[PDB]
Amino acid sequence: HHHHGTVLKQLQPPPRGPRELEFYNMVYAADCFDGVLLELRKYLPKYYGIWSPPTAPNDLYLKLEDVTHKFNKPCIMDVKIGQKSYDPFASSEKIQQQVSKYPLMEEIGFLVLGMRVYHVHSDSYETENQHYGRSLTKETIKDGVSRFFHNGYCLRKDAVAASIQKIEKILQWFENQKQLNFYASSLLFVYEGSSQAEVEVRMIDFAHVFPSNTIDEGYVYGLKHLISVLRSILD
């Protein structure tokens, strides 16, 4: 999610930092017997608690499972999900800056934040940053996403596109019934860029999750368009 066998997720200034920590403590509480939340655990990084560096005791980090472990040369893609990349409490100025960062969000329903794709054609990593995904359009999005699945010179990993789509359909089913709204959240995609399919699809960024009434339509929208783009990549 950020730094550091775990990964250290740096918590953001209040109110964002306390919100993400509340969320994690909520789904991972020991007395949690809410089936929706317990089911949610499947799609998240494992959470091991908080951590401060001895020099900054007021500086808080989440201890998170590093899901790119188990993988030899992992390919990773970060995808923000939804039609808004802002929560309902954002001011007008925030909303304009978020909308102006990617105006097609409203229509495509997801945004590609970054990729790192292992090329066996070169034993090197190809990287895409913020501005690649902020440039894809209705017309280029289908190729844009398929860039992530070009594993070297040979296979364009259909088996990986297929695994991806099954796991995320399962997140589609959870969100098809729930009590929580996710703004500016993302999915993390990992697959194996060589060998030692097997893929990871995890939900990750949680500083803007809110109690809901009720079904999160912006998120089901974005999920649905992403399964669309991934289905047609499979054909």
Author numbering: -14 to -11, 71 to 262, 377 to 415
Give the original sentences from the paper that presented this experimental model.
As an essential gene in mammalian development with ubiquitous expression in all eukaryotes, IPMK has important functions at the nexus of many important signaling, metabolic and regulatory pathways, exerting influence through both kinase-dependent and independent roles. The kinase activity of IPMK is a well-characterized node connecting inositol polyphosphate to lipid phosphoinositide signaling, and is critical for AKT activation, Wnt signaling, PLC-mediated IP3/Calcium signaling, nuclear receptor transcriptional activation, mRNA export, and many other roles. All crystal structures of IPK-superfamily kinases have a consensus ATP-grasp fold structurally conserved between family members. However, there are two intrinsically disordered domains in several members of the superfamily: an N-terminal disordered domain and an “internal loop” within the kinase-domain that occurs between S279 and Q373 in human IPMK.
Further, removal of the disordered domains from IPMK does not dramatically alter IPMK structure, as a 2.5 Å crystal structure of ΔIPMK maintains all the consensus features of the IPK-superfamily fold. Nevertheless, we were able to solve the structure of human apo-ΔIPMK by molecular replacement using the yeast IPMK as the search model. As with all other members of this superfamily, ΔIPMK has an N-terminal domain consisting of β-sheets 1–3 and α-helix 1, the IP-binding loop consisting of α-helix 2, and a C-terminal domain consisting of the remaining β-sheets 4–7 and α-helices 1, 3, 4, 5 and 6. Two ΔIPMK monomers are in each asymmetric unit of the P21212 space group crystals, with a crystallographic dimerization interface mediated mainly through contacts in the IP-binding helix. Taken together, these crystallographic observations and enzyme kinetic data suggest the native N-terminal sequences of human IPMK can form a previously uncharacterized and structurally conserved ATP clamp, stabilizing ATP binding to IPMK.
